[PDB]
C-alpha cells in the first residue's frame, strides 16, 4: 500500500530515523514524495526532506528546501543548475535594503 | 488488441487506481497509459516517471500520431521534467499538427530558453510579427 509507505517514511522522519529510511528508498518505494517529501520540511524536521528531494530529483524545490534547511553551499550548488532567482533576489534585496555588499554580491551571479 | 482496446473505448473504471495498476503492472510494453493517464492527465508526473525509468518516443509518438494537440503542454512537461531539446525541435521541424507559436513562446518564456525555433519562427514572423 502506497499510503502506508508515505505515512511510514513520514514517521521515520518524525522519529528522525534517517539512515534506515534512506537506504529503504533503494527499495521500490512507490511512495509519494512532494506529499511526504513535502510533509517533512513542512514539519520543519529538516535534514531529511533533503535526501528525499535529492533521490527523487526535486530541483528548485530541493534547492529551496536546502536553503530553508540551513543548507546553503549545496543549496547554491543545486541552484546553479536550477537558476531559480528566488533565494538569489531574497539575499540580494535583504543586503541592498540593509546597504550590505557581501552576500548579495556573492550570490548575484544569477542576475 | 483487447486490453487497451477498452482503455480507448470504455471509460468506467477508476482510471487512477487503474493507472496505479499500470504503474504497478510491470508488463514492459505499456501504451494504454499513454491513453488513459492523459485521458485524466497525470501526464507531467507520468512522463516524469517515464523518462525516470525511461522514455524514448512513446508519449512522443503518441502525441505524434495519436494526438499532436497536447504538444505544447507536454513540451512544458518536458522542460519541467528538465530534459533535452532537439527532439521536440525536430517534432516542430517534422510535420506538426495543431499548435500555435503564441503558446510555445509563452511556455518557453516561462522556461526562458526560446533559443532555436527558427522554423516556427518563420511561421510566426512571416505573419506580420521573435
Alpha-carbon separation of residue B26 from B21, B22, B29, B106 (angstroms): 9, 7, 9, 37
Q: What is the C-alpha separation between B128 and A95, in angstroms, rounded?
A: 45
The answer to whether B82 contacts A30, with C-beta atoms less than 8 Å apart, is: no
Cβ(A21)–Cβ(A13) under 8 Å? yes
Q: What is the C-alpha separation between A65 and A39, in angstroms, rounded?
A: 12
Cβ(A61)–Cβ(A53) under 8 Å? yes
Q: What is the C-alpha separation between B110 and B17, in angstroms, rounded?
A: 32
Tell whether B39 lies on the interface with A, counting CB pairs under 8 A.
no
CA distance A53 to chain B (A): 14
Closest chain B CA to residue A81: B82
Q: Give the number of other Cβ atoms within 10 Å of residue A106's Cβ.
A: 12
Tell whether B82 lies on the interface with A, counting CB pairs under 8 A.
yes
Q: What is the C-alpha separation between B122 and B130, in angstroms, rounded?
A: 9
What would you report as the CA-atom Rg of chain B, rounded to the nearest whole angstrom? 16
Instruction: Tally the residues of chain B.
Output: 130
Crossing angle of helices A61-68 and A73-82, in 10° steps, is 160
Question: Experimental method used, please?
Answer: cryo-EM
Cβ(B97)–Cβ(B65) under 8 Å? no
CA distance A99 to chain B (A): 30
CA distance A91 to chain B (A): 22
In this complex, which of B20, B23, B82 lies closest to A59 when CB atoms are compared?
B82
Cell of A66: 536546502
Q: Give the number of other Cβ atoms within 10 Å of residue A79's Cβ.
A: 24
Interface of A with B in 57-96 (CB under 8 A): 57, 59
CA atoms within 13 A on the CB side of A49: 28
CA A49 centroid distance within chain = 6
Secondary structure element (H or E) that encloses residue A108, with its range: none
Tell whether B23 lies on the interface with A, counting CB pairs under 8 A.
yes
Q: What is the C-alpha separation between A79 and A63, in angstroms, rounded?
A: 6
Amino acid at each position: 500500500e502506497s499510503y502506508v509507505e508515505t505515512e511510514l517514511i513520514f514517521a521515520l522522519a518524525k522519529t528522525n530515523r534517517l539512515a534506515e529510511l534512506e537506504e529503504f528508498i533503494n527499495g521500490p518505494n512507490n511512495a509519494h514524495i512532494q506529499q511526504v517529501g513535502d510533509r517533512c520540511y513542512d514539519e520543519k524536521m529538516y535534514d531529511a526532506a533533503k535526501l528525499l528531494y535529492n533521490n527523487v530529483s526535486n530541483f528548485g524545490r530541493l534547492a529551496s528546501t536546502l536553503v530553508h534547511l540551513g543548507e546553503y553551499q549545496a543549496a547554491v550548488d543545486g541552484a546553479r543548475k536550477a537558476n531559480s532567482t528566488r533565494t538569489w533576489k531574497e539575499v540580494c534585496f535583504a543586503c541592498v535594503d540593509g546597504k550590505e555588499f557581501r552576500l548579495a554580491q556573492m550570490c548575484g551571479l544569477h542576475i | 488488441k483487447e486490453v487497451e482496446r477498452i482503455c480507448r473505448e470504455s471509460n468506467c473504471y477508476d482510471p487512477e487506481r487503474v493507472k496505479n495498476f499500470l504503474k504497478e503492472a510491470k508488463l514492459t510494453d505499456q501504451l494504454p497509459l499513454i491513453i488513459v493517464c492523459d485521458r485524466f492527465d497525470f501526464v507531467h508526473d507520468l512522463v516524469l516517471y517515464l523518462y525516470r525509468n525511461n522514455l524514448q518516443k512513446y508519449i512522443e509518438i503518441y502525441v505524434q500520431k495519436v494526438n499532436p494537440s497536447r504538444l505544447p503542454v507536454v513540451i512544458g512537461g518536458l522542460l519541467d521534467v528538465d530534459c533535452s531539446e532537439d527532439v521536440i525541435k525536430n517534432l516542430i521541424l517534422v510535420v506538426r499538427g495543431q499548435f500555435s507559436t503564441d503558446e510555445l513562446v509563452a511556455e518557453v518564456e516561462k522556461r526562458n530558453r526560446l533559443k532555436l525555433l527558427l522554423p516556427w519562427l518563420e511561421a510566426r514572423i512571416h505573419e506580420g510579427c521573435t
